[PDB]
Each structure stands twice: as structure tokens, then as C-alpha cells.
Amino acid sequence: PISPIETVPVKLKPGMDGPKVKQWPLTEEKIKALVEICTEMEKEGKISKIGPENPYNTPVFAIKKKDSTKWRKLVDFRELNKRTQDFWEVQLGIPHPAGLKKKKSVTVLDVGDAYFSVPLDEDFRKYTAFTIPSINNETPGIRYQYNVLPQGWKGSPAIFQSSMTKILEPFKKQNPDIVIYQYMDDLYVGSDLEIGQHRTKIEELRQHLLRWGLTTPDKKHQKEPPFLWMGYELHPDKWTVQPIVLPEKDSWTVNDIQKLVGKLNWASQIYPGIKVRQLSKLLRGTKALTEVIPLTEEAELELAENREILKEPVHGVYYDPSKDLIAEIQKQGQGQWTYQIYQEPFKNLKTGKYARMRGAHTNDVKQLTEAVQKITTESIVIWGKTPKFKLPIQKETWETWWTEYWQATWIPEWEFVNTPPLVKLWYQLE
């Protein structure tokens, strides 16, 4: 019983045969969920069955959120996305409000359901198809196709906008003090209210979403032992502002001074006022790499100087909404992880680091994924776009564990690469 709203035309970029990605293996645990959840979707009519005739395909996987609702269905549509047309409906319909980042807290709502109340272009469903597999391949593949707007497809938000706006219209009008952002399947609500006051306000908006357009949002799950829910809230008022890359000591060896100059030479790309020849002269001889301790008094006056130069925020911050965002993450230390976000190389727009995780959960891939997910969270609240990740791992490894740790509704683009001592120099800025 989908809305009587008309079918908005949807077509893709020229010369793009749409998605045709194959499905990766899934755990029995995931299958069951990905099943019961999709079958009901058949009855509800938001999905129908289709056979081999549809040569297109996109992947799906279940992720177990820690909320009162149930499993979450995720249809990786990154491809279909890029393949899909340019939707002005978002170009204007989804303008990022600056003050969003400036708030005492912000909450994340999964409002995916809202997209079932609207139908999808009759002539486009062939591009949403996914295939649920089975253990040991008992049977062949069961392939479902979308009828309504698919959760997590760049087009979906774009279209639904008008509806989402009128719905929130009352709430925002009531307490205009609140700034609401829409991103794919999430609703970002920030306020400078008190944690308790904020929660309640959220719940209100969560209530409203019920009475109107049967917008049902996942219901969180609270408990006692280790209180995770207390941190579900997203406070960006004290968001890690990078500025912890320094070096200092007394009696320095050749090795030391040598390494130091090596650093600065590269740093000269991020900071102009840099004098490298100074120390280079201090060590202009085939001296012993080790014991050698060329204690200089002249270098000091300039060594502290480079610091004065790169003293605070660098003059270069310039976000151009025409360019993509890039994120770089490197394994700097045990448990600790560092990251940077740039549009142009060596001119980073922001920096940061995913530190030690307060919990016995020890897993490299996990630490990384959690990092990327939290990095993305930031990139969203600010610029509003998701940065391309240059992952510090091999395609193979990531591809066999990233799912068993992901938890967000949206998914970022990512590629695999390796880093040199330049970045791993503990001087992250790339």
C-alpha cells in the first residue's frame, strides 16, 4: 500500500550498465537475519522476487546493531550510487548547516523506514537487486528486487526530501533552537542543551516521527554493567583538535639530529617558514652515526624557531565543495591510530587520531574500522560528505572482517595502500 505519489523519473549516467557486483559469503548468523527480514519485506510488497533475467546485482549483509529493534539490512549500493544520475533534489534539498558541528551534543537516528512509504521508478527496480545465499550452497541464490525507495541509495533521500521537510517542519518550528541534518539513512540532531534535556528532546522528535508518516526509528537499548549508551551521544564541542606533533630533548646524537632534519624537510610542504640547511650544516661530515653528539648552540636558536613558525593552525584551510575528501589512517603505535582529511595533498583541512579503546576488545581490523567509521562521522557533521579512505591494510584482510565490526548505516569508499616513514614519522599531516 505505497503512497499515491507520482513516480519521479530515475535514470543513470550515460554508458553505465549499473551495478553487477557479486555477493560475498555470509555467516549463518547473518543469513538467518538477512532472510527473515527480507521475506517479510516480500509480503509487505516493498520487494518482489526476480530470476536470472536481471543481470544486475548488488550485495547485502546483516549487521547486528545493539538496539531494541532487530538486525539491520545493508545493501551495499556504492556502485549504483556513482552510476546514478545527478540529483538536484539533494543539491538544494540537503544544504549543510554550519552550526551543526558547533553544539554540546548530537544524536544519530536511523530513519530508514521512512523510505518505504514512497514508491520507486517502475522502470528502475532492475538496478536494486541483491542475492541472499545459503550455507554450503544448499539451494541456489534467492534474488530480491526493490519496489519502494531502497535504503541507502543516493536517490532515495534526494526524492523523499519534500516529504521529510514537511514532517520535521512542526518539530523544528516548535524548538527552532535545534539544527537537523539529513544524511542518507541517518538524522543528525544537535543541541547545546543538557545531556538529559537533549535525550528527551530527541525522544520527542522520535515520537513525532511516529504520528507522522509512520516514520519508525530504531529504538536504542540501555543497560547497567559497562554503560555504552551514555556515549552514544555525539559531543563535538570538545572534538579532538589536532596539534600534537613535536620533538624536544637535550644532548642529541647524530642519529637524532639526522632523523629530525629528515622530518622537517618533508614538513616544509605543510609549513613554509622552515629552515632545514641550518641543522644540515651542523652535521656536514661523515661522523659516527651513533656516539656522535654535535651539541650546537647556534641550531637551538633556529630549532625552537621552526616551532614558532608551525606554532598554531596553518594558513591554508580552504574547503572546496567541488572536490572529494580523502582520509588517511596509519598504525602509529599500539592501540593508537592516527588520521588526516584533505582535499589537496599536504594541505590537510583537519587532523586527528583514534586512541586507546576503553574495552578488552583487541583487534587490529576492528580498531581501524571503528576509526574509519568515527572519522566518517566527523566528516559528515562538518562538510557533510564522506571522504575516500586510503586503508593501511591489504584488500584481502579488510575484506574478510570489515563487516563483522561495522555498525553505521552508510558506507564509505575505500582503497588499499601503504605508508612510508614520512607519514609514520608520527607527523601525520599528509
Partner: antibody, heavy 123, light 108 residues
Framework: QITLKESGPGIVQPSQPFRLTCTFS??????????VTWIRQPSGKGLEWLAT???????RYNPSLKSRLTVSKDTSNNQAFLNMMTVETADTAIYYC???????????????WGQGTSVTVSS | DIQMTQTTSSLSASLGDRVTISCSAS??????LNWYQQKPEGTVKLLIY???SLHSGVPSAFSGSGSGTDYSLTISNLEPEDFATYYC?????????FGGGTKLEIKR
């Protein structure tokens, strides 16, 4: 600051039941971190945990009493309650209520109590 | 449902003295232990949380200590008011349990 006083029947014939009340002033059983906890202190014994009432309606009892124990809370008038059925000798003790609050991600203790009531069980 | 045991039942000390109370658990509570002080007059007040963090309004002398399944509570220099019963509490497994407090009486 916030405070909570309790009140009971004072005396209850064994096998009969009773109802204790905790009238609090300061917080609310409608705030993510708040809560109300009933602790019983038997004659000469130490402190025993009976049950704890939580904002989200999630109530929890002691596995040993839930059978003859039930809690409540008229949120509108800042009052939580403790109901005990079929009371036997032992139960004669001083019951206290306490405002419990999940202060933060790692902290959750009983912050404020109040001299409890004395319920006596005798024929 | 963790068996909480406060070994030392009732100790004796004097003004100026230093006292340490021993609370033992039945399984790593990850510091989920509190400290309640019940004065002879009946009233029970909150001293500290996280087996370490000092509760707003409680004097420095009250320091938190402990790890694993063995924790401790120590008062720097005992003053006439600190002579009461100290109840140890845990909060990992929901059946909140108090391990018979430790009496801190006047040594005469």
C-alpha cells in the same frame, strides 16, 4: 539538594503483606540516568539489596524475593513504591530508598539515601 | 550475584591513625565497586565510586584503591567523625551485593 523520605505501615502481621513508599524531591524518574533503589537492613545484619526501579520502566529484583516482591513508581508525583507480600519474621527490618543515577559511562552508585522506615512483623 | 566479603569485620584505631579496609569480590568486577559509610546514628552517606573516584563533598583523606577482585579503602588521618561502619559495594552482575561493612571503632 534532592532528598527522599520513606514511609511504611510500621507493623505488619506475619503472612500478611505491606507497601512502603519513597517520596522524593529533587530529581525525576524520567531522566535517562536517574533511578530509585530499595535497600533493606535486617536486625543487626548488613545491607541487603532488594530491587531497583529504572526510568525506562526496566525493573529488577533480587532473585530471592521477586516472588513476593513488586515495585512501582507514580512518576507524576515523584513517588516510587515497594510491595511485599506474605511477610515473615525475618522481614522485620529498616527499609531505605535511594536515588540511583548512572552518572556516566563508568559510574553508577547510590548517591542519596535517607534514614529508612522500620517495619515490624509480630502477632 | 557476586559473593562480597569484607574480611576485617571491626577494627580499632585512634585519632590521627591510618586505616585501610579490605573488600574482596568473587570475580573481576573491573573496579565496579563503591564505598558507603553508615554512621552510628543510622544515616548512610555516599563516599566514593569506581573504587577510586571521590564523591563531591567527601574530604581528601578518603582515597580510593583496588583492582581485579580485591580492593581497598583508606583514610589518611582518622578524625572523630570517621568512626562508623564502611559498607563495600559492587555493580557488575546486577544482583547488587554489599559485603558486610567494616566497623571502625575507637581504641581505648
Amino acid at each position: 539538594q534532592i532528598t527522599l523520605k520513606e514511609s511504611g505501615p510500621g507493623i505488619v502481621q506475619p503472612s500478611q503483606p505491606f507497601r512502603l513508599t519513597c517520596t522524593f524531591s529533587g530529581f525525576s524518574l524520567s531522566t535517562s540516568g536517574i533511578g530509585v533503589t530499595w535497600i533493606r537492613q535486617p536486625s543487626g545484619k548488613g545491607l541487603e539489596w532488594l530491587a531497583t526501579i529504572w526510568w525506562d520502566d526496566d525493573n529488577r529484583y533480587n532473585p530471592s524475593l521477586k516472588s513476593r516482591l513488586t515495585v512501582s513508581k507514580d512518576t507524576s508525583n515523584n513517588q516510587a513504591f515497594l510491595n511485599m507480600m506474605t511477610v515473615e519474621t525475618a522481614d522485620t527490618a529498616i527499609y531505605y530508598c535511594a536515588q540511583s543515577a548512572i552518572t556516566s559511562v563508568t559510574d553508577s552508585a547510590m548517591d542519596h539515601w535517607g534514614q529508612g522506615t522500620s517495619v515490624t512483623v509480630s502477632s | 550475584d557476586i559473593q562480597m566479603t569484607q574480611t576485617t569485620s571491626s577494627l580499632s584505631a585512634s585519632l590521627g591513625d591510618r586505616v585501610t579496609i579490605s573488600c574482596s569480590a568473587s570475580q573481576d568486577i573491573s573496579s565496579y565497586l563503591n564505598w558507603y559509610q553508615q554512621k552510628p546514628e543510622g544515616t548512610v552517606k555516599l563516599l566514593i565510586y569506581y573504587t577510586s573516584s571521590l564523591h563531591s563533598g567527601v574530604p581528601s583523606a578518603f582515597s580510593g584503591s583496588g583492582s581485579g577482585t580485591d580492593y581497598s579503602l583508606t583514610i589518611s588521618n582518622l578524625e572523630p567523625e570517621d568512626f562508623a561502619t564502611y559498607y563495600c559495594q559492587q555493580y557488575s552482575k546486577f544482583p547488587w551485593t554489599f559485603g558486610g561493612g567494616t566497623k571502625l571503632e575507637i581504641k581505648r
